[PDB]
Amino acid sequence: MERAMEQLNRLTRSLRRARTVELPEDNETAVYTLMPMVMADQHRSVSELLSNSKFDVNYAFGRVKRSLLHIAANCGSVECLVLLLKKGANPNYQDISGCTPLHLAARNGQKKCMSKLLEYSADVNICNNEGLTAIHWLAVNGRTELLHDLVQHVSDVDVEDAMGQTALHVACQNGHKTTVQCLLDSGADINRPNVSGATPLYFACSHGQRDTAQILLLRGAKYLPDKNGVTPLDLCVQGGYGETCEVLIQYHPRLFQTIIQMTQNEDLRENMLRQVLEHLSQQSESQYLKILTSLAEVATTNGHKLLSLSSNYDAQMKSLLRIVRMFCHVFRIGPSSPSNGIDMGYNGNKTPRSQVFKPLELLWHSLDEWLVLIATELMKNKRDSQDVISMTANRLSAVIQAFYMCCSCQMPPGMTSPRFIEFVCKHDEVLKCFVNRNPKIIFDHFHFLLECPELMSRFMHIIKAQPFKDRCEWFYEHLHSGQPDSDMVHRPVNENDILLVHRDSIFRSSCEVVSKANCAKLKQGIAVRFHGEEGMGQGVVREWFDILSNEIVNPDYALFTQSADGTTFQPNSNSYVNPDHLNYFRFAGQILGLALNHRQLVNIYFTRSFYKHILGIPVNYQDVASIDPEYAKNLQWILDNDISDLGLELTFSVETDVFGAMEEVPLKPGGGSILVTQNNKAEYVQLVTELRMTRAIQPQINAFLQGFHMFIPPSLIQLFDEYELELLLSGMPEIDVSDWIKNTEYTSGYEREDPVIQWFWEVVEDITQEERVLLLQFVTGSSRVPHGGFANIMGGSGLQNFTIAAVPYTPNLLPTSSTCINMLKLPEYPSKEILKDRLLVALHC
Amino acid sequence: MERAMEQLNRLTRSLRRARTVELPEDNETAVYTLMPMVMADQHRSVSELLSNSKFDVNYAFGRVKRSLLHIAANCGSVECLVLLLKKGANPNYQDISGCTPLHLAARNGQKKCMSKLLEYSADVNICNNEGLTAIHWLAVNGRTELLHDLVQHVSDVDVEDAMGQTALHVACQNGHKTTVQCLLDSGADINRPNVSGATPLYFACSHGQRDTAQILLLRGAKYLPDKNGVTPLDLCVQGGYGETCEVLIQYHPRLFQTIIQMTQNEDLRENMLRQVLEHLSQQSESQYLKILTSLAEVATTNGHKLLSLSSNYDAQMKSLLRIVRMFCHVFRIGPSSPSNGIDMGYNGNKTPRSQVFKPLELLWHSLDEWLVLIATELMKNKRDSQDVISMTANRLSAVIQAFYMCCSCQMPPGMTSPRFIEFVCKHDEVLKCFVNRNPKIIFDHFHFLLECPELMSRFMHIIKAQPFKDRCEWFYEHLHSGQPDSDMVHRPVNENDILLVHRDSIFRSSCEVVSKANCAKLKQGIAVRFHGEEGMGQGVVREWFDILSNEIVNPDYALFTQSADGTTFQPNSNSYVNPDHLNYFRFAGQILGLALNHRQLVNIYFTRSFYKHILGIPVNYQDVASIDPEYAKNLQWILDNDISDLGLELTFSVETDVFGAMEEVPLKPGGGSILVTQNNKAEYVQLVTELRMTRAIQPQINAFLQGFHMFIPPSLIQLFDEYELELLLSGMPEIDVSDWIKNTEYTSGYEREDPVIQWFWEVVEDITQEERVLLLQFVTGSSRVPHGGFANIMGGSGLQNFTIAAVPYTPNLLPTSSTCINMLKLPEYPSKEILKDRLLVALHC
């Protein structure tokens, strides 16, 4: 009969909202309704008509093949969970990844399921095929409360992955508290060696969990190395964190010495040691002393042992520096307080210096014990001057580097001790005797001993004591290195190495651009752009300079002029008319400052005065000649004469006919109140020159350098000679001896028939280009022959090719090059060997 | 004798600082010392020993060949300037560019030089070979003071470039005051026709110099067109500035009408007219009226003249809109005050409406005079229904577009007048009769008449009145256009169309990404990136979606489930457990929202309910069947029966067994206090359904759409049918009739021997793909056959290939597809033509 509808007649009336019929005859259908309702947490609904059914739970679903009993892990359906277990189940199934509802409850954080599951039970000691246990699952997650609420059910703390890790091994690898105390309360093993022999502790010293480690050593946790032999402590280094060591050392003060041993080694990136020592140094004064004290002893030891001659030059030496460099750095931060860094409040100290520095004093005394002998040895070796000398020199070279390092920190910034100088006072001989052997060297050991101008304030001395001929291939080092100082050999990078130029007004526009940027972004071969247009990288860069190669010397802002030669330039004294000029002078040197760093020439060259004022020299007498010959020619006549002869005196105040005013102005205060002494003849005119400069040069020159020194520091340049200097502004010349032969002019009734000229050419045609280029400028001032060759020489005004001038000028005297006359004046030597020998004496100087 | 040194013996003593000897015997030397000293402004120094010399000034220098007399232009060396002119000179030389020291003094701003030069004189009427005169040089620079101080020397104001420009022509082309008044005071010509006939005034109307123009028309400056015939006034338009016109019209009120004539034209970018009219409208109320009034008359005229049938469809129509569109825009800014914009303070007005709108009223009355007849014509044409009809329709179509434009501005935003509706009330017949002819059209004229839902709040009406068969190639328009609404056919661009994804957590990561951006940046086929890695543009984009094609339907956050069919999805009702879900639902639609805009499928498809809740439909009865058959099967049995039969009633409060509570809850307040009426049988269960939805669907659905509508507005979609909808989510299917033939299942003791099946296939194999795809889903619900073909069908649970079912089900009735049974139930038609004809009646519906 149709009474089968009667159950539904109840369902429709009052249960159709909640439920359907449990007679679809497919277990897959049952999940298609229950799978929500399980997750609905419909506690008893699941049972209501399920009271009739023929579908057991051991059948599962999904590609996982997972039962709803697993699913109940998710939403906390504890009542349905029980309802399932009234039906029965084997919860720790062979799930696809070795999982189980228990693990999944933990992941879902349903407490009561874990409880009610474990009011029943199924073995937890099981694992995933991926490795983990229930307990390990919780340890990484650090799921404390359930995990403490879990231990009551379970027997063993020997639980392990098949790999062997315990929960204990996890919680410090991850970093966590509570997992400790429970298992400590449970009585687990503290050393519990891994398969590799590692320990729970061994993790933490990789980690930085200072506080647990404070508990464990309190708890009595043992210290010991790996099965391989390494220590825990080598790791807390590479973790960089030092309070964890500070915690460690409260439990083991013994090991403080070990760090002094860990630094002798060389396996490390040294910087990490600084992190540690930086911190600890700021953890006591009494520490801070004993630290430095101990270091010096090591330094002192290795110092002696570098002089233990068998020591390799590599081993001891590198060990040394790594102690010293920090030692220098530590003193910068400086005398610590207990538990704290540098002693605040009181700027002095408790007289540490002897206690800390005594081990040095023996080494330096020991150094002195060698060096003082050594001066005797090489100096006494008078008739006769492998090289143990050069060997031992190198060993000491490291030490010589120390003597700046040890010394250059207990002084304000930049300033040196005269104690350094006193060292030089005794050993000056030997010091020359090294560079006598080692031209190759300065930028390695000595690199900074030069660098100080306050030492070069004397040690200009040795810079000259090494003469010119050695400087050539190291004049080249500044080219085929970067500048061999490492900040200049090296080029940085930045995310925006780009500048945008406005094309029609590059002279003022670039001033608006480059002023709007900072040095470090610009200390690089940066690419350049137009304003709103690309420029093909290097292309616009070529355009940008070589346009500025015009704009700079164009009278675009009333800025420069040509000197008396023509074919060159010198700044206009009158550029103070328009006050922005200094912004252009600062700008000017910056632009050139790039030109040399990245080493493409400029299509400009300048007179001699300008290079000289840059490079820092007091300009000599004869440079005057390019200003006006009628001035200089007659001053030369004065250099023969004295006050006794000429029957005239200089009024030491003269009409400073400048700025539309014959400004009566003295030579000098005090200088205005004297008459000419015979000694003064060149000396005031030097001052007239400098005072011919000061009116426009002095402010403007400084403005120019301060823009210039951005891109090269002033002191790298001290090698260079001003004559050679332009070669990086212009490249080497094509030495055009061929076209030179073509247009040699001759005077004094004079043509190549003269054997003097035959003897002349015979010397010329064996001369190095390193001297031919000098002679070219020595007599022209300017350098470059035009594009076609030496025939293109125009003399500025009238095509005066170069002239060779021999005259009855005394053989007892040296030449003078009538420069803008494009001429060199020479004495007629009597004979060949006299010419061939003494013409060299004439020309080299 | 050596007494020649005596002059220098004075020089050294007291003049060597200031001077040298003037005997170098080269005039080029003299410049090499003086060229500074000239610029030094050494007033008298230049003369001192120059008193003896043999070098005249007419010799010059540089590639310019320029004298120091020119150079004195620079620094104001008036005394030296005179000193030169004591020596004599011809200052207006044939300089290289036709220049002269006078021009150069002006450029350098040295007043006295200009004075002292012109205490002497040389003809200023000369010019540059580049074109300019002295006076023109000053005009552009606007160098007033010297220029006023200049006129006293000079005779003519007829001065001109050889091109013919006067100073007067310059100063307004550039914009400047003072040059006017001086020459006005001088008595220059105000019209002064150029070679092209242009005038000084003619420049200003290109320029915007309102104030001079205020002076000139005050001064009596004449108005007149070009030699070509164009006006000044056409330029002040394209300069966009209107007060200059406002200045103009104070002097010429007559021309106010001309702008009404300038807008009829079509040479212009219309926007500039808005700039003008925007301003002027805000320059009086009485203006503001007369403006709109005049416009309507033009509109009214052109309106009639569009109905002057000879008018081309292009000309009058475009003229119209350009009046109306502004007219609409003007009212937005709205009723102006005198001299000012919109009347502040009082939100009403002075009753403008009839005065402004009357010209419309005739046109619309005139429109009504046509349309009311026109309904008669086409409707009375009853036996018999080129096409002047379609022609005149198009003409009116423009007008029909007006009727929204004229109407949709005196109302708050979005809302319409029922006056519009009243128009439809009379003309509904004709309105259908157009689209009856014009399927092709809506997005051109009507585009917005649809767009209003408040009009579609009725005009849903005509959207259905046009039936399905027309929608196919315009269902395709949304594909082979963008969406044919222009904002969607068009894609914007931005400088950063880039998003950065984090690869291992794309589901939550992308939520962190896309929430961190704004719509307009994202309304584009934007490229995508990984976090710290590139992704090959389209590649990661494919990866990003097609990973999300998994992540979305993965139970990754407890979000979706599979529906009863399997092989599809529906949202989990239980996703309210974890409150961020709405952020994912909003997120969800956004992600899909891109998928359709840029038209690559998703590797997902959904059930029918989900599409229906999206698209805005009230879900029908039979969609229920995918939820539970045991529910739906028995409700079907109820649809045969009524309260009279079944002997049962629904308790209108039932156990809402949800959230672990048999929540006794009514059907509805008021619904809970009734018993079943026979009419109610489907009606409450609809409400049960919607209330089976509301518990989870209602909040979540809205969250999903609000993320979705970002990338398509809701109303573009109103064309679509939900069945066809998925094709843009999945692409068209490979219609696999071949493999379909291979695995056709058969039941009711039934195999292809039956002629019914022969008659079946005979109909099937002529069916369009546009209907075959429907039938596939009509009986499967799901769409896609797996990769290998129709043989891969798995039925979800048990490989139930599709089944064809014919039964003694009455021929008087239509099919029902037992869908997840993969079956279609059909009546056995008695004969072939009955099958061939009436099976169509069965299947199309």
Numbering used by the authors:
A (entry chain A), B (entry chain B): 1 to 385, 442 to 901
The authors write:
HACE1 is a tumor suppressor E3 ligase that has been reported to inhibit breast cancer cell proliferation through 26S proteasome‐mediated degradation of RAC1.
Our cryo‐EM structure shows that the HACE1 homodimer makes two head‐to‐tail contacts between the N‐terminal AKR domain of one monomer and the C‐terminal HECT domain of the other. In our HACE1 dimer, the N‐terminal helix and connective loop occupy the putative E2‐conjugating enzyme binding site of the other subunit. We hypothesize that obstruction of the small N‐lobe of the HECT domain could hinder the binding and activity of the E2‐conjugating enzyme, thereby modulating HACE1 enzymatic activity. Consistently, the HECT domain small N‐lobe of the dimer is slightly expanded compared with that of the monomer.
